[PDB]
């Protein structure tokens, strides 16, 4: 796959670039067909880890058509506007609109920003911006490229903002098949948003940091950038002391051989181990109840009666780490492709530890309520939280209260 996968890019990129026969020339710089790259920017497959190669190539066009992808699969739950592609000092400028504008810069090194930055600029809080790194051959340690980032920016202030610019994002490319790395700096003093690190902020709700309003939180960073970990403190109480574990999944290649089942189960598993590890690692010193928060990114063609079946004893296998762990409930959030219509039906497993006798795992889907708000509605009897709204805040241990 990472081959056949980057393999696959180069052509389908090229194929929405061409628009004539053989021999006779083609246009210096068309639009790229759509409905070519619609397979890419809707894909159940994972993109990002490599795309971000595609964007500093020899050939300005394909950049152009590779960075359309990054924006339109980027910004696919916002009604995206038109795209205008333009020349900069350097490198080409890709600029869109969606619903305020993004700015989208390609760069081959790190000392190489601060010069197209400024200009880049030039195109004109509210917006946003984002610069994919082709390569850091020249530093090391991370905080070694941090550092230098809050200078690049620090020195720029003045017109990051006279562009009205929200947030900016650095990416960092790959090619071995590791997702590329982000940093993203908020906000009139521009300042890393460390709890979005390694995430593009537009899929960011992926996370579903919202859920964490009733405590602190706290990053805590790790080797593995499916993982993200938070140290959370109820804002009503400082003894409820808890960590949020909130892993994604989005998948490179499935086999033949196994079945949807077995796939996620297994891909589930693969992660806990890790997750799990991270953990037995850090310092969990008074924390009391862990969550696990597993979010599958592909859709997929199994059924819910097996999607359910496949997190049978699911934590039963991980007894004592969870257990020396303090983790007390998971939440896995699948999508289902409608047998018939096709459409994509998303799931919730939600797995409880909690009356420590027997493990209970709720299911459910996610729909619209009356008012407008999206609902956990339970697949089967009603569960704990039937038309409770998806995105209720973890509440808080009352009874510590002073």
Same mark, same amino acid.
């Given at each position: 796959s990472v081959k056949e996968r980057t393999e696959q890019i180069e052509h389908i990129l090229k194929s929405s670039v061409v628009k004539v026969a053989y021999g006779s020339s083609n246009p210096k710089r068309s639009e790229p067909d759509l409905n070519i790259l619609k397979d890419l920017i /809707?894909?159940?497959?994972?993109?990002?880890?490599?795309?971000?190669?595609?964007?500093?190539?020899? /050939?300005?066009?394909?950049?152009?058509?590779?960075?359309?992808?990054?924006?339109?699969?980027?910004?696919?739950?916002?009604?995206?506007?038109?795209?205008?592609?333009?020349?900069?000092?350097?490198?080409?400028?890709?600029?869109?609109?969606?619903?305020?504008?993004?700015?989208? @810069?390609?760069?081959?090194?790190?000392?190489?920003?601060?010069?197209?930055?400024?200009?880049?600029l030039e195109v004109i809080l509210s917006?946003?911006?984002?610069?994919?790194?082709?390569?850091?051959?020249?530093?090391?340690?991370?905080?070694e490229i941090l550092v230098r980032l809050r200078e690049i920016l620090d020195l720029n202030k003045q017109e990051l903002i006279n562009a009205s610019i929200r947030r900016i994002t650095f990416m960092f490319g790959f090619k071995d098949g590791s997702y590329p790395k982000y940093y993203t700096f908020n906000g009139p003093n521009y300042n890393e948003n460390e709890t979005i690190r390694h995430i593009e902020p537009a899929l960011a709700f992926q996370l579903e940091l919202g859920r964490l309003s009733n405590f602190n939180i706290k990053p805590i960073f790790t080797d593995n950038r499916n993982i993200h970990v938070y140290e959370a403190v109820s804002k009503t109480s400082p003894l409820d002391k808890r960590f949020f574990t909130r892993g994604i999944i989005r998948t490179g290649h499935i086999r033949d051989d196994i079945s949807i089942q077995e796939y996620l189960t297994s891909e589930a598993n693969r992660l806990m181990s890790d997750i799990l590890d991270n953990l037995e690692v850090t310092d969990t010193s008074?924390?009391?109840?862990?969550?696990?928060?597993?979010?599958?990114?592909?859709?997929?063609?199994?059924?819910?009666?097996?999607?359910?079946?496949?997190?049978?004893?699911?934590?039963?296998?991980?007894?004592?780490?969870?257990?020396?762990?303090?983790?007390?409930?998971?939440?896995?959030?699948?999508?289902?492709?409608?047998?018939?219509?096709?459409?994509?039906? =998303?799931?919730?497993?939600?797995?409880?530890?909690?009356?420590?006798?027997?493990?209970?795992?709720? @299911?459910?889907?996610?729909?619209?309520?009356?008012?407008?708000?999206?609902?956990?509605?339970?697949?089967?009897?009603?569960?704990? @939280?039937?038309?409770?709204?998806?995105?209720? =805040?973890?509440?808080?241990?009352?009874?510590?209260? =002073?």
């Open positions: /809707d894909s159940n497959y994972v993109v990002f880890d490599v795309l971000l190669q595609f964007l500093t190539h020899q /050939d300005p066009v394909v950049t152009a058509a590779a960075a359309q992808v990054y924006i339109r699969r980027a910004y696919r739950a916002y009604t995206i506007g038109d795209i205008r592609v333009h020349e900069g000092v350097t490198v080409p400028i890709v600029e869109w609109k969606f619903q305020r504008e993004g700015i989208l @810069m390609a760069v081959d090194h790190l000392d190489d920003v601060d010069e197209i930055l400024s200009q880049s917006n946003v911006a984002n610069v994919c790194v082709a390569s850091t051959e020249g530093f090391e340690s991370e905080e008074n924390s009391d109840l862990n969550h696990i928060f597993i979010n599958f990114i592909a859709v997929f063609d199994i059924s819910p009666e097996d999607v359910e079946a496949a997190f049978g004893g699911f934590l039963e296998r991980f007894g004592k780490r969870l257990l020396r762990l303090r983790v007390s409930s998971a939440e896995i959030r699948i999508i289902i492709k409608d047998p018939q219509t096709g459409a994509p039906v =998303p799931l919730r497993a939600l797995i409880n530890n909690v009356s420590g006798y027997v493990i209970k795992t709720e @299911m459910y889907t996610e729909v619209k309520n009356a008012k407008g708000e999206w609902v956990f509605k339970s697949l089967g009897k009603p569960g704990s @939280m039937h038309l409770r709204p998806i995105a209720t =805040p973890y509440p808080v241990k009352e009874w510590l209260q =002073p």
